[PDB]
Design a protein around this ligand. Sequence first.
Ligand SMILES: COc1cc(Nc2ncc(F)c(Nc3ccc4c(n3)NC(=O)C(C)(C)O4)n2)cc(OC)c1OC
Length: 268
Amino acid sequence: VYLDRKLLTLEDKELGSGNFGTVKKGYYQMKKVVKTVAVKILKPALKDELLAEANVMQQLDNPYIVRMIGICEAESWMLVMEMAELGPLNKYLQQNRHVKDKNIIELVHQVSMGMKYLEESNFVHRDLAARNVLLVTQHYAKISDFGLSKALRADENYYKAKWPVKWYAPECINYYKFSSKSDVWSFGVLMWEAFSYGQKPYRGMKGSEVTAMLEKGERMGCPAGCPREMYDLMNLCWTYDVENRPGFAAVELRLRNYYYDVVNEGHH
Ligand SMILES: COc1cc(Nc2ncc(F)c(Nc3ccc4c(n3)NC(=O)C(C)(C)O4)n2)cc(OC)c1OC
């Protein structure tokens, strides 16, 4: 998990900013090859957040989840991860409005596979949104930003807690309870975003207005050109009662089946 600072090269080209510090592009010398990396570089709390994030990613091993290369203490604390070259899913779709329907289904299904793995691993993401799905290629998506993520206790299926309200299930808002099912709810908002080509959900509404809207049984409308089968899945993800809402196993299967229908139809 601990990396050799001299084996790491940093570019001055920035990928993002925040109170934590900056994320920059770089290269790390592996056993024989050079690997392109994204490096989170810190500006006590911030450090322990970083180490907790690192410790979560250290446990995870999946094609559809950004990999950690390791960590590094030097000028600042550094978290070195594999680079997703195409950037965040929302910005991508905003900038490429001609991405096809089969292709969006393919990506969101890839996210359901990453999330199925995380459910199986008993981790809650807690920040699953299109901004946190990074593209390796136009046909290869990975889940990132595990800064809010939690390993679940062996005896509990939920974690008890500024919040991204628009992606949050009622039980999170009302009882501060975050489970894989509440991640499923975010996945539904994430789906809406992807079929809206990266538009913010609940446009023009404040967090409390959204809460009031959902409480009243109201949901976001079908995005233009979204297949009814995919909008149905969004709504199913938006099931108020945690206990009736599907888990990622069922969600991923629904998406898998439908993608193969669209893959089949294309050939016909
Ligand atoms: C090539 O263009 C881009 C590429 C990437 N690739 C990429 N791969 C793996 C990663 F771990 C990674 N991490 C990362 C990067 C930046 C960040 C954050 N994380 N976190 C943040 O809170 C904000 C969002 C503040 O800045 N980025 C991300 C882009 O934005 C996330 C982007 O657009 C600039």
